[PDB]
Design a binder for this molecule. Sequence first.
Ligand SMILES: C=CC1=C(C)/C(=C/c2[nH]c(/C=C3N=C(/C=C4\NC(=O)C(C)=C4C=C)C(C)=C\3CCC(=O)O)c(CCC(=O)O)c2C)NC1=O
Ligand SMILES: [Cl-]
Ligand SMILES: [Mg+2]
Ligand SMILES: [Mg+2]
Length: 281
Amino acid sequence: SYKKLIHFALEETNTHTLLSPSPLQEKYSSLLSMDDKTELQMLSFEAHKIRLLRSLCIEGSDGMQVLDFAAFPKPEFDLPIFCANFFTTAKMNIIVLDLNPLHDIMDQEDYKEKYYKDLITLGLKYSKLLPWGGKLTSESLRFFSPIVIWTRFSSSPHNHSVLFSAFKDYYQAWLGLMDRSEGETDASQIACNCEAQHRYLTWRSEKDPGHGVLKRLIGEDLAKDVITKFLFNGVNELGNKTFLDYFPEYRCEDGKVNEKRSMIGKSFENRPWNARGEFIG
Ligand SMILES: C=CC1=C(C)/C(=C/c2[nH]c(/C=C3N=C(/C=C4\NC(=O)C(C)=C4C=C)C(C)=C\3CCC(=O)O)c(CCC(=O)O)c2C)NC1=O
Ligand SMILES: [Cl-]
Ligand SMILES: [Mg+2]
Ligand SMILES: [Mg+2]
């Protein structure tokens, strides 16, 4: 049960700071699927440095277990975004676990060395235990860190045990970053951190792979509501640019968003970072 990972994370967070209830708890807590057989459980909090810590947990009556757990920092704290997205069936697991970088780590080097230099060892430990998931939407790499755990594996006691240990080790590392995060003082830099987060939220609210599953469970209208106002809350408030403003490649011949998840196509059949965290893909 992924609920135990949520309990772990909330307990650990309250040893590094004090969580307060998010106002979203008044509008997003429990939601049944349309056929009433599956329950969506949602929690939301905030802290002095955390704009939104929220979780969605789904435990269906046929082996389906889903976890979407994220911590979004306030724009004054340029912390990575903690990201745990686990899609599990009775046999299969499709897993993304990462400290998503707020700013670009592809071309520039300052942000990458600021947050990930001391974490390469952690990424190396679990990249051996949870192998690269294979080819994936190329545009998604723009948001992944050198220590990302992208993996597919069949269910087993051993594999889920490794997954639990990875979540806990990665979340404790993120909390250690939070300890050291000092508030930004430059006003324009705060704006830059805010646009970077809004851009992140705009990508995922439009293209995150789990949206199809949510729409099947609770219908198009409520799914879009949960996506834009809970899971990626901030797409409406942190900026005015649209998805097509950030990613004009997706503008279709009709002026709408291209139905394709990936304009480039899926690539990177092998992990595109080496054992030292240098991008090689
Ligand atoms: C920057 C952010 C980021 C994240 C976290 C993410 C995860 C992610 N989920 C995937 C599959 C998948 N994910 C899901 C389902 C779910 N998945 C969930 O994370 C949840 C909460 C559900 C359920 C409601 C399913 C069903 C598949 C396989 C089918 C498909 O690929 O559409 C894939 C492989 C497919 C691809 O390459 O597109 C990735 C990279 N990708 C990103 O770009
Ligand atoms: Cl697939
Ligand atoms: Mg402790
Ligand atoms: Mg109902």
